[PDB]
Amino acid sequence: GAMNSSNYAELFNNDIKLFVDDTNVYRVTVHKTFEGNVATKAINGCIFTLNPKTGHLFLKIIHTSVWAGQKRLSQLAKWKTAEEVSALVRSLPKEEQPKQIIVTRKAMLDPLEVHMLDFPNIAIRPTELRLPFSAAMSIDKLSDVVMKATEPQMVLFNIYDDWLDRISSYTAFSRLTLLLRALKTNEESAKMILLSDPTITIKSYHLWPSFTDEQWITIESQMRDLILTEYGRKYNV
């Protein structure tokens, strides 16, 4: 069934599983036409597919060309997400195929289920958690590789950099989700917190700064204070 706070530590057992978030697959800007009507212009997009135990991220870039001459795009996006996830699974050797796939939006269950009918033993599941994967395009290096792409292209990353050398997947996944929660709620401040110190850099093969353990504690606390502030401002508490 659904993933929620009750069964949260299942993400970190040894059963292979993948989160799928389709929020950035179909991305548009909105603008006025010469005659004063509204039109959209699509920009490049991506399927965020992530194994929360190991940090392996399968960033499938969705080139604007996909949309060309297609109707009901936001609906198609769910089918193209599910088509590309199917293809990824099929591309994986048998022992690397996931036993479960957790979609972060329920609208994807039917498209994914239909596309996985060749894999009856891979369970497609919703979640009740309110995960922040939509803010993945706030991570400068993912946003850069998506925008620049000139064709469909899969790009591989480890979203945890090298953290697992020193902390657990549970802790890794809580840091990632806290970071992304902060970036979602107030990108400008969240990004500020990460880079205010010119001396802590981002390895070319990483996404996030090379913080020491102590510095991560200070960072994590700065992100927590960001998130709480923004809440009282939202609601007047």
Partner 1 sequence: MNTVPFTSAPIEVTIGIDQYSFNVKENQPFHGIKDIPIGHVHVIHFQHADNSSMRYGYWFDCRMGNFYIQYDPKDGLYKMMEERDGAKFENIVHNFKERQMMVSYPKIDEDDTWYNLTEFVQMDKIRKIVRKDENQFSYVDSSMTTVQENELSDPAHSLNYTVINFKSREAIRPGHEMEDFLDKSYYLNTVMLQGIFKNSSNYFGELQFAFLNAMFFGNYGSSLQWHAMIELICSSATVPKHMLDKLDEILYYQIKTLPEQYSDILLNERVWNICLYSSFQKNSLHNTEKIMENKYPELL
Q: Which of 52, 55, 98, 111 binds partner 1 (CB under 8 A)?
A: 111
Q: How far is the CB of 73 from partner 1 (least distance, A)?
A: 12
Scanning 30-38, 61-69, 105-113, 213-221 for contacts with partner 1 by CB under 8 A, the matching segment is 105-113
Helices vs. strands in the chain: H and E counts, helices first: 6, 8
Scanning 7-15, 37-45, 55-63, 107-115 for contacts with partner 1 by CB under 8 A, the matching segment is 107-115
Q: Which of 83, 100, 155, 158 binds partner 1 (CB under 8 A)?
A: 83
Scanning 44-52, 88-96, 114-122, 147-155 for contacts with partner 1 by CB under 8 A, the matching segment is 114-122
Q: Which of 113, 129, 184, 186 binds partner 1 (CB under 8 A)?
A: 113
Contact 88, 60 (CB under 8 A): yes
* Three-state secondary structure call for residue 160: coil
As to burial, measured by CB atoms within 10 angstroms (0-12 exposed, 13-18 middle, 19+ buried), residue 29 is exposed
| 24, 34, 43, 69, 155 from 38: Cα distances, Å | 21, 9, 16, 18, 34
State which residue, 53 or 78, has the beta carbon closest to partner 1.
78
Scanning 9-17, 88-96, 112-120, 200-208 for contacts with partner 1 by CB under 8 A, the matching segment is 112-120
By CB under 8 A, is residue 114 in contact with partner 1? yes
State which residue, 113 or 230, has the beta carbon closest to partner 1.
113
Q: Where are the beta strands (DSSP E) in 106-226?
A: 123-125, 153-158
Total interface residues for partner 1 by CB under 8 A: 11
Contact 153, 51 (CB under 8 A): no
Q: Using CA atoms, how far apart are residues 104 and 108, in angstroms rounded to an integer?
A: 8
State which residue, 72 or 94, has the beta carbon closest to partner 1.
72
* Three-state secondary structure call for residue 208: coil
State which residue, 76 or 227, has the beta carbon closest to partner 1.
76
Q: Select from 218, 143, 223 the least CA-distant residue to 176.
A: 223
Q: Which of 25, 66, 82, 159 binds partner 1 (CB under 8 A)?
A: 82
The CA-CA-CA angle for residues 68, 70, 76, to 5°, reads 115
Q: How far is the CB of 46 from partner 1 (least distance, A)?
A: 20
By CB under 8 A, is residue 25 in contact with partner 1? no
Note the residues at the interface with partner 1 (CB under 8 A): 76, 79, 82-83, 110-111, 113-115, 117-118
